[PDB]
Amino acid sequence: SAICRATTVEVTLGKGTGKMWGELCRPAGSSPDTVVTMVHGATYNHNYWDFPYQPDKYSFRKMLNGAGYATFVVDRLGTGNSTVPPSSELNLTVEARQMHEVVQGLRTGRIGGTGFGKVVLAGYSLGSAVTSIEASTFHDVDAVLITALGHYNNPAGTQAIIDNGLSPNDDPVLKDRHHYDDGYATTKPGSRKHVFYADRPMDPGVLATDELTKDANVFTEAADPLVIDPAVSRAIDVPVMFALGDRDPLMCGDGYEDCSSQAALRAQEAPFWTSAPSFDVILVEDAGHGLNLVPNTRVYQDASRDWLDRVVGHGLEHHH
């Protein structure tokens, strides 16, 4: 049971700045040299990476602390407790530069006081695109965790989200937070089960908690050619882990992302990660888009932890 402090970070936004909310946690009675920064995907916020239902099972953040890593989870601008600007001011490039400012903040100690020797950047859905752009542009991270985002997507899956899209102003969870402009969307109540989790077995408590902790996105970001541009990923020169669910409705399918086997998936993605000194791949069985939220999520947590231990470590070991 971990020691945590929330803050806001001033971050570049258009001509001026905006506020990004984040939470820094350390394991209790320790001070790690590695911090893992986690970037959520579209229609999520920080809750995805620190899930408040059965956290000993579903909280990735908590698992990391328990493994001796420091963690920093953020609400992206437009979401959560962060600034909600006009949507025209937000795009992936802008958001990547904001993450770059968070990474620097963590390295220098401006965020969290201690300063961190190693910084791992972890992403999910379009969070992974932000993560990739950041690492590709600024080269100031020691490793990169890419989840739920491949270079081929399933257009029918994409289109299915759009069919279940709606303004946060007509959504019961988000109605009363802000008057959102026309560039914001979220998902229809009850739809996430299908369009994200592919109706695969999940705890009802998880589905409900996910629906209650959902959020808005700036939807034009999904159409940004940078999401799948090979120039972004091929330029990344630190260790990469790539994780994907074998029932992921947004990626997987005949002629799209190859979820037939872990090896086949690696073979298909490898050409896109040519500067990476290592490229690890995990294909999670019976899992849709949300890897943190599935019943067999521990397999994925364990593989991620093992990878971190192998490739950066946490700064508390005595090992060789």
Numbering used by the authors: 61 to 380
Give excerpts from the publication:
StnA is an essential enzyme in the Streptonigrin biosynthesis pathway. The crystal structure shows that StnA has an α-helical cap domain positioned atop a common α/β hydrolase domain. The data clearly shows that Ser185-Asp308-His349 constitutes the catalytic triad of StnA.
The structure of the enzyme was determined by single-wavelength anomalous dispersion (SAD) phasing method and refined to 2.71 Å with an Rfactor of 0.1923 and Rfree of 0.2196. The final model of StnA consists of residues 61–375 because of the poor electron density for the 60 residues at the N-terminal region. Residue Thr77 in each monomer is in the cis conformation. StnA is stabilized by two additional disulfide bonds of Cys61/Cys64 and Cys312/Cys319, which are located between β1 and β2 and between β7 and αD, respectively. The catalytic His349, located in the loop between β8 and helix αF, points towards the nucleophile, with its Nε2 atom at a distance of 3.2 Å from the Oγ atom of Ser185. The overall structures of the free and complex are very similar with a RMSD of 0.232 Å over 316 Cα atoms.
